[model samples]
Target: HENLYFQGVQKIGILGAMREEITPILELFGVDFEEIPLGGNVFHKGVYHNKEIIVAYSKIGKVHSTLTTTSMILAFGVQKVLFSGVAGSLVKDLKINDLLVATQLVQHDVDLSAFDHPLGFIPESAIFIETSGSLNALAKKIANEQHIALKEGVIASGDQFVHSKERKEFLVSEFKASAVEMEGASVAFVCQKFGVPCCVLRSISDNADEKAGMSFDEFLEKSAHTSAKFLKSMVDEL
Candidate 1:
């Protein structure tokens, strides 16, 4: 049975910060996953879109997302990782529900310049981690067919939820990021360490301004569901 399980299907891993974001894919595919717990993180191993997968809710921060992703690589041996979630828009043109695919991920909270390193730089790693090109192309094709206006740019992740214009502008000026989220950079960092390819797809839920809280609350689930639908579409082609 173990040998049979290792057939031709590739094992992909999916990460989401909230239950609403990840639940759609699991339910849509009717995946009968087994829960494996590891230090407060639960990894769900199952099949989705005729492919093997392990999905998990990484909660709401860089640390949580990093831990969850590392476990997926070390424990389940996931070949690829995909993160789908909601983010605050940094650019004026990107409004709520618009999709942003992360071509590069950088952690905005880091400042290691004192150590003769660039801002947001890992001690011994590239300052910017990139997503898989093939996966990005597949996502672009899927978005074009579905008529979803997809924008590809840098995504900046941090521990704080961005809800201020000043903070948003700072991120944009500093990193030239199009979207701000809580997990994308951390996931990308881990994937880079393991030599596994990863991608992040986000739907804008807020504009990263003073009124961002209300806007985010209003469209959080709706935007997340839309992102999940896109993830399903991408999986179908995999």
Candidate 2:
């Protein structure tokens, strides 16, 4: 019965870096998800918008995000991965509360130039992981329908929180990143390895400058809510 009914159903896995970033969407899902714990993180399995979903908070940074994505793909067999969270704006037009969907993500902290490899290039892997085109198109359509302003561009990821003018300028100059965050590239990496369709959705909470921390603190919740609202509609269409 289960197999027949779910023969073509989509299994989506959602990851967020912080509880504040994920809680709004999880609440909106409106299901009492079954909790399954693994490697000190909990995965909540449930149905949202009539689709199977496994949602988790990856606790920030690359390692945690990579681990969570692997589990979702290997352990849970998710067909797609969606990462939603806050980011520091690097582009001039991406003001606070605006949404950005990653066209590609790179690990900005990586440097292996001694081997003549590009920065952010893993030994035998791509320096950048691209989002699925179909997924990106869906995000664009949903944003337009919901009246949410959306930008699609490269996202650069690094371990350190970006709040310095010097660092911000460096990322913009070097990578041409539109937004900076801690987890998107790592999540994208793992999903790529498993051949899963993936997209990173970010809501701008602050500009990556000296005033970033204060602005991030002030708009974090509101930005999260905005992303959640769009995500809810996305699931409905998925």
Candidate 3:
């Protein structure tokens, strides 16, 4: 059974995969929160200072994240949503704990060799969804004012984690993506479907190449904490 809840005035929803990335935002406003437990995933629902903000963990795939995002919009009626977590850096300028705001999301994993969709050959259409212009701008401003280094660029999302230097290089060369993550693009897609203002921000957690795994856990805390603080500040302005 799905655990559903109603918090009267939630205006925003936040999605992430871990408590480190989520707790600060929830605690910041000191709202009444409920937890929804799913296998390998957990969802939190509550209102921050009486403003509704549904939170959930995206279990690491395009489908899982998309499903949760759709639920947040259709089921909770969240007007705007923010996703924060970790991703692998595809560019040199992004270091561990650095943040990125997704202006465009491109699904680099979808291959339509048998289909005639625009995303198949035309570079970016099926999966490259654009976020709300106003929210996008606002997110950047919040990042700057909070002293968080925020970079805006195209984010490539896929189901597979990049563990090979070859694969990471290929995607970077082909897509010119600044970072890679599994959930952001899918989250963006669902938000686009419902006409909700969706924005994605991520902290660099790895380089997504050979030997990068060694650095993953080390940066998780810092990355998540930074993201949590960023979210709290952004929500205040919203």
Candidate 4:
């Protein structure tokens, strides 16, 4: 009751791209909750590590993630949101299985450059939305204790999967993002609209290259499990 995290937050929401991405925290961990269906999506409302949490898989892509996160805030009134999932490495140094805690998030596919607006900029809205500093610091602390080497910087998101080295290089040069993914930034975008704190945690699952298709099949499952477990560790402390 006296802890800062517990006092500051009433409910925390967790989003993953697919069921398996969030399944580990629900099945492997001793979590207590009930499932509520919404728009054909199931929101798992529960208590994890003594913290009130709602876990849901928003499916792939930014639109789904945005809708799910909006529900988490409007319906559940969660004060915080965390996206736990996998990403493709945009930078060579950020190898597969490495952790990428997003300090800033952007939608790389959002383009209005013809109007002199930035690539990710949405007119008066944000180009690079900053994730919760508090959450990022807490994540770094968790990584340190778990002996996980993590790179904290920009993490870009879009609907299309980056499977070519050329696109990967473009993302790096344009966004300076360490990793590219499908949904994390959209979740952050929704949370920012609702004035809720959020964090995006990604486990690198591919190199974002020509071989990314085969590579994703190999590491996605592994990284999903790892990402969920790692997220559980952060939840316990919160």
TM-score of each: 0.93, 0.94, 0.86, 0.95
* Per-candidate clashes, comma-separated: 0, 0, 2, 0
Alpha-carbon shift of residue 195 in model 1 (angstroms)? 1.4
* Local lDDT at 202 for model 1: 96
Model 4: pairs clashing at backbone N, Cα or C within 3 Å: none
Give the per-residue lDDT of model 2 (tens digit) for 1-238.
5565546777899889998988998998989899999987899999866678999999989998888899889998999998888999998899999999999999999989988887788787887788899899999998887776899999999999999989998888888999999999999888888889998999999998999999999999999988877776777777
* Candidates sorted by TM-score, best first: 4, 2, 1, 3
Q: Candidate 2: which stretches are off by over 4 Å?
A: 1-7
**lDDT for predicted candidate 3 compared with the true structure:** 0.78
The residue-by-residue lDDT of candidate 3 on 90-135, one tens digit each, is 8999988898888888888777756665331344445468887887
Residue pairs with clashing backbones, model 3: 9-52, 10-52
Candidate 1 lDDT, 89-128, residue by residue in tens: 9998889999989999999988888888878887767768
lDDT of 4 by residue, 112-207 (tens): 989889899997798899789999899899889888898898988999999997898889999898998899888998898888999899898999
Off by over 4 Å in 1: 1-7
Q: Global lDDT of each model?
A: 0.88, 0.89, 0.78, 0.87
Error of 4 at 154 (Å): 0.7
Residue 60 of model 3: what lDDT? 70
Residue 19 of model 3, lDDT score: 61
